[PDB]
Amino acid sequence: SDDQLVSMSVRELNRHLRGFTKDEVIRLKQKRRTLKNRGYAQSCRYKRVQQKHHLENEKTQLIQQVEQLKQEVSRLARERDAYKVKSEKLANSG
Amino acid sequence: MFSDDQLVSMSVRELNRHLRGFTKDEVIRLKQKRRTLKNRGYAQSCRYKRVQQKHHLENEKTQLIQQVEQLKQEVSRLARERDAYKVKSEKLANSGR
DNA sequence: TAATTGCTGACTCAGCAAAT
DNA sequence: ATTTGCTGAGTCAGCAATT
Ligand SMILES: [Mg+2]
Numbered sequence: 001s002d003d004q005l006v007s008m009s010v011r012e013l014n015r016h017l018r019g020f021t022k023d024e025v026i027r028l029k030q031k032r033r034t035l036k037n038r039g040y041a042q043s044c045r046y047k048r049v050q051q052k053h054h055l056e057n058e059k060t061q062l063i064q065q066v067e068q069l070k071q072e073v074s075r076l077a078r079e080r081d082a083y084k085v086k087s088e089k090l091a092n093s094g
Numbered sequence: 095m096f097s098d099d100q101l102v103s104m105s106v107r108e109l110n111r112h113l114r115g116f117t118k119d120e121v122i123r124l125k126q127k128r129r130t131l132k133n134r135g136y137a138q139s140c141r142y143k144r145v146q147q148k149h150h151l152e153n154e155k156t157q158l159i160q161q162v163e164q165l166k167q168e169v170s171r172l173a174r175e176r177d178a179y180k181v182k183s184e185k186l187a188n189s190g191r
Numbered sequence: 192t193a194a195t196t197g198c199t200g201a202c203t204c205a206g207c208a209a210a211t
Numbered sequence: 212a213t214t215t216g217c218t219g220a221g222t223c224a225g226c227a228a229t230t
Contacts (some may be wrong), residue, residue, distance in 0.1 A: 010211075010214075033214085038202060040216060045200075047217090055151050062158040065190060069165035076172035083179035093191035106195065129195090134221065136197055141219075 001028075006035045102131045 005028070008016070013032075017025055101109075109128065113121050161172075 029162055029214095030124055034203070036215075037204080037217095041202065043216085044218060054146070055148070055155070059151060059155055059158065062155065062162060064167060066158065069162065069169060073165065073168055073172065076169065076176060080172055080176040080179060083176060087179045087183045087186065087229085090186040090191050093186075099211080125202085133198095133223075137221070139197085140199065169218070 002031070002035050005032050006039070096177075098131050101128050102135065 020028070079093065104112075106125075109125070113124065116124075
């Protein structure tokens with residue numbers, strides 16, 4: 001209360017609450033519920049920020065992948081053109 | 095009742111004019127109500143904008159994934175055209191020209 | 192030498208479903 | 212099942228920029 005109450009367990013809890021005032025059995029469970037909800041919000045906020053960075057990282061790595069392929073296209077264009085000229089210049093061999 | 099929509103569009107100068115003569119613990123209550131209503135809208139913008147930034151990022155990823163596919167196609171296209179023009183050249187070299 | 196605006200991390204609650 | 216976990220909407224506090 002409030003730190004051994006969230007960390008405490010489903011049975012262990014009911015062991016510590018066996019003869020408890022039946023209106024304070026409800027109050028303590030309400031209290032713990034609320035404290036956990038606070039921790040869920042903390043995860044939810046956290047998960048959101050992690051997904052956001054993950055999405056932006058994916059965007060970055062697609063951008064640099066495009067860049068790689070841009071470099072290859074230009075190499076291959078040149079290599080093809082080296083042969084196309086070579087090919088055409090032989091064909092005028094006459 | 096007292097429609098919120100109007101209370102938030104008002105100026106704090108215009109509001110004071112309205113409670114020209116007015117109770118104290120209700121004046122303080124009413125200005126704080128106004129703020130709460132504004133904070134509600136501020137929260138919505140925050141929420142709405144970030145889902146929209148998420149969707150925009152998701153589209154951007156989609157647009158880029160496409161360009162990669164197109165580039166990959168072009169890559170194998172050029173490599174094959176290189177090969178074809180090379181094979182044609184070596185054959186022409188064989189005949190001797 | 193005030194008070195208001197807009198933003199945002201954090202909390203609380205409702206309701207929804209799955210794991211326990 | 213109960214409790215758990217998650218998430219959108221609201222509320223508040225407190226910060227800086229604005230008037
Ligand atoms: Mg029941």
